[PDB]
Design a protein around this ligand. Structure first.
Ligand SMILES: *[C@@H]1O[C@H](CO)[C@@H](O)[C@H](O)[C@H]1NC(C)=O
Ligand SMILES: *[C@@H]1O[C@H](CO)[C@@H](O)[C@H](O)[C@H]1NC(C)=O
Ligand SMILES: *[C@@H]1O[C@H](CO)[C@@H](O)[C@H](O)[C@H]1NC(C)=O
Ligand SMILES: *[C@@H]1O[C@H](CO)[C@@H](O)[C@H](O)[C@H]1NC(C)=O
Ligand SMILES: *[C@@H]1O[C@H](CO)[C@@H](O)[C@H](O)[C@H]1NC(C)=O
Ligand SMILES: *[C@@H]1O[C@H](CO)[C@@H](O)[C@H](O)[C@H]1NC(C)=O
Ligand SMILES: *[C@@H]1O[C@H](CO)[C@@H](O)[C@H](O)[C@H]1NC(C)=O
Ligand SMILES: *[C@@H]1O[C@H](CO)[C@@H](O)[C@H](O)[C@H]1NC(C)=O
Ligand SMILES: [Ca+2]
Ligand SMILES: [Ca+2]
Lengths: 498, 503
């Protein structure tokens, strides 16, 4: 039986410098156990579950899992990580393994979503920057070939945020790891992203500062952005389809004489200047471009991530434990000088900004990149600047890039999750809205790789719990989606990519 | 008789530091003579449509500086005083503007700004000539002009006005910011304020393009392809497919669209290399300096056809070379191609006589009842219109006044379809001079709108402009008061001004 062959496979495993913790059989219809997930998902499929550590240096190691389904498709898949973790993405493992992929995930070289394990340990950094992900691919392919007589044919990657960065690190630096890569909201330009995150507190101050903008004021700011910008795409639907067109004039919210900013409905000049800073690109020494602006429209959730007047953990950790080796360093004191030090350091090219994709192109790889337009954690503009960087570095036009690299801005989408629009594009269980390839980016990538049928658009649904209210076809960049009618803006065919 | 009064005036003038060259009566219907206009400013014509008394004089401003100025005192006098301004690094009296104003009956002045010619060489070794250019020539012309006007007319003058664009727009804003008592009403177009960083931004273009042989260089034909692609991407954002980018802020063009395909070569002029697209992206990028500080906004997309000549042609930019040679470095051999942000930091710290003109606190002018109407064309190839928008926002946030509060005394109107202080292809003729004249209704004539605002309290809620075919008005549009955006909504054609809404 599949089960019996699983439950005695441990003895066959031959991975070097590794410690196999368990080999278990997981039937369909159980909540998958999580005792190895540091301080539930119902399987709809059976699989063989291998958990192990792999040593990656004299001072570092990974934890990883491989999920080898009984209903195996002959395809291998790696998931990735989030933040500064540290945490296997079991949700995405289940998503992929449900489609019959031999699926792996690693902890990225440490446990927990924080940087403390980097302190005085450059090898744990090297794992975070590239090596943990690639190790999980190498070991996962070994396990998969050992378990299934037929081995695997094509290899895929699914990940968002840090996982988006990890997919792009694969494309740029390990072209042979994957045939098809689905990379969302990527944490590439990583050092400058991290700096940009630190910059927010320097602009806002703490909650007592004259520069601070309250949450109710951010809501007013949000509403005024919607007013100025919603209709630019042609549809008055509460959604900024393409924030590039939105260049908001926040001075519209300066208080009139009968109003006080304490009411939350208007802002002072100093407060407006904070908000303008949020909506401005960050430049460094010598006037070099560091990071784009926050795209307008992400305000509600961006209050939680960045604007609340408290230190941004990821940056605090990165600067304390990687940049400066100073556990007491006060992120509020961040400056562009600090950013220049961090950039010079760029450990293991975690920047992940190589624009020359030729090796991956020439080996026949395909990469589908997306980013949400309401992203409150990683500005979508970063992904558009990256696309331009690839085009200009390779000297390849968009229509030439389309042979191997297609990028889809998603309206109405948050950070690796739904927002309030047609965001459910099938990048994971949380964004699932069907199995037609046009509706599911994972299955679109299998179609592109195996049948040559390339995504011209990425269709997303606006869900109400489980019900599809409407869908929209998100355009292939650089085309812009515009509402033209004659039907309602809920009619996908009332939109055109131009 | 007026003519007799003119003929007896020279002997009556007695103004400190003034040497009066001539007082002449000029009838209507004659070419206005140009003996005192040097070759460098075009020498010798404008035909008068009004009679006036013409006073030409020099006024010493230091031991080693002086201005030339004129005052034109019309016989059909309205009781109003007006000063014109200058252009470029000049140096030349704007006689066209003087005739524009004097024909409305203003007692009108202009000065040469402290030297003759549109170039910076009179700055060589002479800070006093720089001071004249930065503020003091214009102000001296006002003080001396008011004295002459009071001396000549029994009734003196009542309100005082300013009309200027480009350098002249900076000059008007310098007045508002630093000489609030000079004018009651100021009409300031496409201003060369943020002057140091404007000049630096001009120097930056060659650093991006290289010369005509560089791999970074984008040819004129390529710039036309870029232009057409920008119109493709951006025309319809305002609602109207009319060939005009109504508000370039919405236009964030993706130049990568013009990367060559595999059968195409950039030598065609129709597509660009990666390096060439990077050049264009730099043109459409803001300039930042040391410590990552904002220096100057991007060039607004849409100005490409004329901006090839002004900036993109692979040749040093004269204004900036002269400014850095004679003012920043005091080295006549300095090579502008070597410009860096460190050079711009030096220049900014120097800021001679606050020529930057960036003061955002207009409280003194507000408190004395002054009004300022500011405009800028959206197709400006010389001074990016974004500079004016950044300035507006700077005033609001520095004064802590909302737009509706500022509306009591300071109103700003982006003008679509307009070039640098001139008509382009759209409804640009707003009455800021002879060259933009489209009638005398105050809503169509910004000079007369200002008279109405100061004297009757009726402020401009919009500035209407005309699209002219020779002297025929094809159509008009009401340009919105910033921050509102003009959007085309129908039901009429985009030529129907009622088919647009300010939002
Ligand atoms: C596996 O490696 C991790 C660091 O990645 C270490 O925390 C852990 O102790 C190791 N063993 C496990 C998870 O059983
Ligand atoms: C200020 O008043 C104007 C004119 O009534 C109004 O349009 C604007 O929204 C007001 N501003 C605030 C912040 O409410
Ligand atoms: C990161 O910012 C630095 C300035 O500190 C700059 O040198 C570098 O180009 C930036 N990198 C990217 C990829 O934006
Ligand atoms: C010219 O003005 C000076 C100073 O006020 C005065 O001394 C002189 O008498 C005046 N000349 C005549 C002819 O009035
Ligand atoms: C007036 O001053 C100018 C300098 O601004 C000088 O060049 C000229 O010689 C002086 N005299 C005349 C008649 O223009
Ligand atoms: C310019 O340099 C000269 C020496 O060549 C010096 O005497 C002068 O003070 C400097 N500055 C000027 C002329 O504004
Ligand atoms: C390159 O080919 C594409 C697809 O045919 C076309 O749309 C695009 O305009 C072409 N690019 C150039 C510069 O002509
Ligand atoms: C001019 O650029 C400099 C860079 O040294 C900056 O300090 C200054 O703020 C800029 N001024 C304006 C008005 O943008
Ligand atoms: Ca919308
Ligand atoms: Ca238009």
């Amino acid at each position: 039986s599949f089960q019996a062959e699983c439950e005695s496979f441990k003895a066959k495993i031959n991975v070097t410098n590794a410690n196999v913790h368990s080999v278990t059989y997981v039937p369909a219809g159980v909540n998958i156990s999580m005792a190895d997930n540091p301080s539930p998902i119902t399987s709809t499929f059976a699989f063989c579950r291998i958990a192990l550590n792999v040593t990656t240096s004299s001072k570092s190691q990974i934890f990883m899992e491989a999920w080898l389904p009984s209903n195996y498709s002959g395809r291998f898949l790696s998931t990735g990580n989030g933040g500064l973790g540290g945490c296997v993405k079991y949700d995405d493992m289940a998503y992929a393994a449900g489609y019959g992929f031999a699926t792996v995930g690693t902890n990225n070289g440490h446990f927990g979503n924080n940087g403390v394990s980097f302190y005085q340990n450059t090898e744990v950094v090297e794992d975070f920057a590239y090596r943990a992900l690639h190790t999980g691919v190498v070991v996962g392919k070994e396990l998969t070939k050992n378990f299934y007589p037929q081995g695997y044919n094509k290899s895929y990657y699914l990940g968002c945020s840090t996982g988006g960065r990890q997919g792009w690190k694969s494309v740029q630096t390990f072209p042979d790891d994957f045939d098809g890569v689905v990379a969302g909201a990527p944490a590439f330009n990583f050092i400058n992203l991290t700096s940009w995150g630190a910059r927010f507190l320097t602009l806002t101050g703490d909650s007592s500062a004259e520069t601070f903008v309250t949450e109710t004021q951010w809501t007013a700011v949000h509403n005024e952005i919607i007013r100025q910008c919603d209709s630019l795409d042609g549809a008055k639907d509460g959604i900024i389809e393409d924030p590039d067109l939105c260049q908001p004039i926040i001075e519209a919210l300066l208080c009139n004489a009968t109003q006080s900013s304490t009411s939350g409905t208007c802002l002072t000049g100093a407060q407006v200047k904070t908000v303008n800073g949020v909506f401005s690109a960050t430049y460094g020494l010598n006037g070099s471009f560091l990071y784009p602006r926050m795209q307008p429209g992400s305000e509600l959730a961006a209050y939680s991530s960045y604007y609340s007047g408290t230190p941004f953990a990821y940056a605090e950790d990165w600067y304390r434990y990687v940049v400066f080796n100073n556990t007491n360093w006060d992120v509020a004191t961040w400056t562009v000088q600090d950013a220049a030090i961090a950039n010079a350091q760029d450990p293991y090219q975690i920047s992940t900004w190589n624009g020359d994709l030729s090796p991956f192109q020439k080996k026949g790889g395909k990469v589908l990149h997306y980013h949400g337009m309401e992203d409150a954690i990683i500005s979508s503009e970063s992904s558009k600047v990256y696309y331009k960087h690839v085009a200009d570095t390779m000297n390849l036009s968009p229509s030439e890039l389309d042979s191997f690299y297609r990028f889809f801005p998603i309206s109405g989408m948050a950070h690796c999750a739904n927002a309030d629009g047609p965001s459910a594009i099938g990048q994971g269980t949380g964004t699932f809205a069907g199995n037609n390839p046009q509706d599911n980016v994972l299955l679109a990538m299998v179609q592109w790789v195996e049948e040559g049928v390339a995504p011209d658009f990425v269709r997303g649904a606006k869900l109400n719990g489980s019900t599809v209210e409407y869908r929209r076809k998100h355009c292939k960049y650089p085309k812009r989606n515009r509402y033209v009618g004659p039907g309602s803006y809920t009619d996908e065919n009332a939109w055109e990519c131009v």
